[PDB]
Structure 1
C-alpha cells in the first residue's frame, strides 16, 4: 500500500547480435568519445529513436495543428537548448535527420576535452 515507485529503462539492444559492420561503427564511437559500454551507445540510439518517433507522428498531422505546434516547438527548443540541433535547421524535419554523434557531442565527457582541460577523451 504505497504508490508504486515508477521506473523505466534507458537503453535498447540491437536485434542482429553479430553484425560485423555495426560492431565496427560502434567501437569507433566508444573509442572516439571514450565510452566503456556498447550500452552507452545503445542508450543514445534508444533516446534518439523515441525523439524521431515523436517527430514522425507529428509530421503526419496538418501543419500548424495545436498539438503539433505546442509539442513540436518544445522538442525543437529542448534539443536546441542543449546544443544538439543547429540554429538554422530549426523546424523538426532535421531532428528527424539527427544522428548519434550529435548527442554524443554534448556529453560533459567531450566538452571537458574539446575545451582543452584534458588533452585526452580518457583523461577527461
Structure 2
C-alpha cells in the first residue's frame, strides 16, 4: 500500500436548472468578462459561499472571545491582501455583503485590460495564453491569476515575447524569407 492522496471538488451546480431570471445574469457576466462556460461562474460562487459561512458563525460567539480574534483578523487580513475588501471596511460584518464580481475584477484577464495592454477583454485571454505577459519575472499563462495588491504594479510584457522584446515570430520571419530573398528574383 501507501498513503492516499487527498483531493476536493471545486464547484457546485444549482438546484433548479431551467429558470430564466437566473440564466441571464450568468450570461451578462460571460460576455462582460469573457468566460468559457458557466462552470467558471459556479467556481466563484462556491469559494464565496464558504467564506460567507466561515464568518457566519464567528459572529455568533461573543466578542473578546479568543477564537473570534485569531480566526477573524486572519480572514480579514487575507481578503485585503488580495484586494477585495476595501481598506476602510475592515470589520467582520462587512464581508457578509461581499459580491461575486469583487473577485472577478482581480483576475489577470481583467487586470491587464484595465492597465492598458489589450484593446479588448478578448485580447487579454489570448495574450495570456500565448505566453506574452510576465508579472515579476515569471511568464504566467492562466487567465485566473487573482493578482495580489502590492504586485499590480509589476505587470508588463515578457523579455522573450516579440511584442515587448526580441525576435519576431515565424510569420514575419517567414515573410522576410518570402520577400527579401525574392527581391532579386
What is the TM-score when the length of structure 1 is the normalising length? 0.95
Deviations 1:20-47 (A, max 9, x none): 1111000111111111111110010000
Moved over 6 A (4+): none
What stretches of structure 1 of length at least 5 have no aligned partner? none
How far residue 64 of structure 1 moved from its aligned partner, in angstroms, is 2.3
The secondary structure found in structure 1 opposite 2:74 is: helix
Computing the radius of gyration from Cα coordinates, the structure with the larger value is: 2
Q: Which has the higher contact order (CA 8 A, sep 6+)?
A: 1
Query: Hey, what's the Cα distance between the residues in 2 that align with 1:50 and 1:74?
Result: 15
Query: Hey, what's the Cα distance between the residues in 2 that align with 1:14 and 1:58?
Result: 27
Query: Hey, what's the Cα distance between the residues in 2 that align with 1:3 and 1:80?
Result: 37
Deviations 1:83-120 (A, max 9, x none): 11100111121111100010101111100111110121
How far residue 66 of structure 1 moved from its aligned partner, in angstroms, is 1.0
Deviations 1:40-89 (A, max 9, x none): 10010000000000010110110121111111111111010001110011
Q: How has the CA–CA distance of structure 1 residues 64 and 119 changed in structure 2, closer, same or farther, with 3 Å as cutoff?
A: farther
Partner residue, 1:18:
18
How many positions carry a matched residue from both structures?
A: 123
What stretches of structure 2 of length at least 5 have no aligned partner? 124-185
The two structures, once aligned, show a CA RMSD in angstroms of 0.8
